[PDB]
Symmetry: D4
């Protein structure tokens, strides 16, 4: 019988290109960041920490990547997704490693999520811009 | 000299029927879910994860089942149960593994809770439907 | 411009067949077991616990499946693989979730590991037999 | 269909009698101990800590009770059970909450394990004697 | 090099859990009750069969909170008042409970331990904890 | 090739002076505190716990020092920094070891953060005072 | 009824003197250490980390103090205490925060353990020396 | 109040992970490689698709061990010698790796970070780590 399925997954060479571009963008902005790239299962591919970035931002970047890979949409959209539902507004942000502020983006290929990128250390807008620079460098 | 009590407990064969039905229902709805069934002490009986379900939903399903088994009522009813009590509204949702959004249902037999079922991966309404399919498959 | 790779992964329907067969085999042997099946990334597909199995065996089964999927060879072979290397004999068994006794088997397809199965609750020989029943039920 | 089974479980009143007797025995011996009694699922029924007992012995007592309840035989017998099997001698003592020195006893009724008692703070022989005093007081 | 401290004793904790559980039985509820010493360490922790699973840790945390601060857990939001920094930060601390059911054990104006009950309403939890305290004396 | 950068880091002798001054300030106020001083990587330099200080305040002091060292600004300013942004107001206070109440201060030397000091056990005011004393010292 | 007992406990001022003397001894030896002093319940009193000491030695020092306070005898004696008992030799060193190497010493006052001191970062000999200095002080 | 410390920079860590992974590709193996700074904090952590799952944390712990002690992880049993207390206690420490594959990053007799590789044999891991170090220069 059939026991397997073929799944698309992000490769480490592309993650490496992405963290190079995200850190270069941070340098161009005058900021210091952490940037994490994870695969489809949420497992590390490349995690880069610039000297002098905020200490807490290490885990935030990892969690942003994990959240974006795990759900397939940008972390900054979470509150919009939760809407007026108080059960979700209380419950979802309380989950371990789930980030609801901006800076995590899914890695989409053929509209299929194959990984995630997360940036922390700047403003939400700066984080997303560095993450987008990483996505563009993957291509 | 009496040291023991006889307690009713959910059996693994019924839990297996439940995860078969819950996953089949998810397939019919076009969704990917995690479904966890636990016994009266909150211990795993069967935990099933469909490929492509959200990563965070694994623990959410487990915690939904645990909450429903631990309190004996559906997780979606928590906010109604807490009402206007601000001490409880702050403190209860902050407990480890306690879920206050819908998708966890107690397994009731003769008015007695003997386990729990929790589904995560869809909307609250989809999660509850799959859990109910599972419950109907047990009996 | 290449960012992705196609990987084979075990599917939850096959994992379900495996836990059905492993538990039926345990029943035929007169034992109570836990059986865990994980995918290529070590994530749960199905985890089944029979009533009355040893409490500690829940995590042992999960860790056996994870170890077998993570390394691609049966957990019972670890000591043979480590040989006379004292650095490895001290360090490898000390890793989190790494099991060096028998009961975890890789799921191999076309010479490629796509997941793992782990059984705990009997002797090593009983655990391996149940795991093998599960593997045969997948294909 | 059938979904449930009737299980025998230790009751808290008996656990309370047991910790009273175990602590009284410790006092009679001139020692200070922790004594834990758990039910069939390994969940606390009564956990008592005498002022001045060793700090580490709190968790040891709990783990002894859990191990004895989880496997159904005295913790002090573990090495005999493991024998010459190096895979088990390395792997089993490395499991979280698994204790292989003496002081945990199963609570047996009709040769069925319905809970566990664990004592820490004295010698292994003193621990087992206090645990036995607790078992006798349950009856 | 040293100081003399008053500490709650395990015999008194045992009296307390007996009285708290007897009160719960009289109320028709099932509870967990935890008694801890001045350092927040366990003295006696009792779980009645059929009490809520989550209430085990709630009881322990209530006792710990009450022993650690020296005032009833139900008073926290009254102490926090309108300070939004404290209202956000204090309830987020591990093992800190801000709903009712934890009481300090006070002797001669001095906190020597704590008792915490979980499994009923806040009001029932506090009543069981008070029964435990009275049994200590 | 360049593989290194030079960093300024707080030294343990200065942290020791700091915890001495903070505890002396607490004694003058009649209160009991925990005071933590960490280096530029958030690692302990000196962590002092006064007998009788609240049990929960131990980790709070450490978290305050860590937060102040990790971001380079006082912990009491967090809400002002978060402003009206609900995404940040929900998400930032939910991070492990991140404290948004007052009492953590960065150790700034020549426009540069080289460590942190955190105090817990009194009112926000008393904590900030003891921390300011440790810093002044 | 009796609900309390009086306990002797180490005070934070003595711990502070201890970490000062232990670090001065380390400086005289040319080494960098962590030194932890805990009270009779194993709770921090003073924990000092010298710049440049091994990263892993931080938790080792704390564990040494905790073990010495929790059992009341030097950590270096554990193997002698375990003797030829294989059950204990496997099980005791596997416990969390339990250290069987030298460097943790109980603080004994009038035949009674009131705390612990632990040093890590040098050889067993250097650690014991720095700890003995803190104790002597 | 301060001291000047040399620290490894993220650009050099990035060069190192590129060279270590290129060496692994040339060997036909799949590896994780972690580079950490002087405080044991991540600089770059790279995981090649298809490397062993457990090797992720092994690589990180190797880097941390090498950075924390300043000598190769493969040398630990040589350093422990015949001391049974250390042979039992040291390999039991969290994140401490005693098999080969972690190397310190040394600059002018001074440890400024660490590199750790896991996924091949000890000898292959060390070869990949050495390639990473050479690429730093």
């Amino acid at each position: 019988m059939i026991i397997s399925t073929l799944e698309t997954n992000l490769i480490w060479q592309a993650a490496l290109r992405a963290v190079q571009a995200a850190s270069d963008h941070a340098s161009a902005l005058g900021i210091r960041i952490h940037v994490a790239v994870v695969d489809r299962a949420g497992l590390n591919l490349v995690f880069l920490s610039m000297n002098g970035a905020f200490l807490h931002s290490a885990d935030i970047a990892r969690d942003k990547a994990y959240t974006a890979a795990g759900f397939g949409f940008p972390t900054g959209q979470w509150l919009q997704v939760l809407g007026d539902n108080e059960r979700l507004r209380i419950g979802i942000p309380a989950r371990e490693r789930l980030v609801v502020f901006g800076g995590g983006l899914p890695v989409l290929l053929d509209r299929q999520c194959i990984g995630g990128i997360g940036v922390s250390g700047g403003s939400e807008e700066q984080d997303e811009a560095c993450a987008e620079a990483g996505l563009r460098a993957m291509l």
